Swiss-Prot record:
Protein name per UniProt: Metallo-beta-lactamase type 2
Domain of life: Bacteria
Principal location class: periplasm
Annotated binding of substrate, by residue: K170, N179
Major enzyme class: hydrolase
Length: 229
């Protein structure tokens, strides 16, 4: 079951995987939830996405200390919006190595974000160049193409049935693709489908703005994105 921990919510998804959820008021849209992941890989912890704020991200680290009690080796963030990168300074203050798409780091200042310490680059087929993602353990990082943003990346967790679409993917009952202010509307559908094709064995799809779902999240997202073209 969900665990409320201060103003955040944590949910175990697999033996070594938890979802973190944090909230920010968007005046005129309500208090918007954003999800990321926490993964235990042996004697260390890996984080996917910050919370919206530094204070909330420090709370994620406090939860990790209490519930796992192992060092956080690294964090990877999935694009340069506040829900994914707003807590970078808290990660740095904690001594955690941080990674983002090179393009996310380039965009960070203009988006009001602090850049990660390290830049990921990607092969033409979308897989991360392995030298740029050292010690990522089970995290398999894939650039699916431009969609929710130009820089959006996705992460599969090897040895589990889980893949994380970030803000690219919405659940199978969603009415819309949310805010498309920075979206590539022409390429969105193809990028959603490329995410699915990169992680064909993932049966649990985790995403930023919906609860975990089946692969129908991918097909439904792509079908909605077909309407943007
Ligand atoms: C939840 C957040 C980040 S995905 C969101 O939807 N922000 C609004 C927004 C998104 C893109 C461009 C301008 C404004
Ligand atoms: Zn976003
Ligand atoms: Zn988002």
């Amino acid at each position: 079951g969900d665990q409320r921990f201060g103003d955040l919510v944590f949910r175990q998804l697999a033996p070594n995987v938890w979802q973190h959820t944090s909230y920010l008021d968007m005046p005129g849209f309500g208090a918007v939830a954003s999800n990321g992941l926490i993964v235990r890989d042996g004697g260390r912890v890996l984080v996917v996405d910050t919370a919206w704020t530094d204070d909330q991200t420090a709370q994620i680290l406090n939860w990790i200390k209490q519930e796992i009690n192992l060092p956080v080796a690294l964090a990877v963030v999935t694009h340069a919006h506040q829900d994914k990168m707003g807590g970078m300074d808290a990660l740095h203050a904690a001594g955690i190595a941080t990674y983002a798409n090179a393009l996310s780091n380039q965009l960070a200042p203009q988006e009001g974000m602090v850049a990660a310490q390290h830049s990921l680059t990607f092969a033409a087929n979308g897989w991360v160049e392995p030298a740029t993602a050292p010690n990522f353990g089970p995290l398999k990082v894939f650039y699916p193409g431009p969609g929710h943003t130009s820089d959006n990346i996705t992460v599969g967790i090897d040895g589990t049935d889980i893949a994380f679409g970030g803000c690219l993917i919405k659940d199978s009952k969603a009415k819309s693709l949310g805010n498309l202010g920075d979206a590539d509307t022409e390429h969105y559908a193809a990028s959603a489908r490329a995410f699915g094709a990169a992680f064909p064995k993932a049966s649990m799809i985790v995403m930023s703005h919906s609860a975990p779902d089946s692969r129908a999240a991918i097909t439904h997202t792509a079908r909605m994105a077909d309407k943007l073209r």
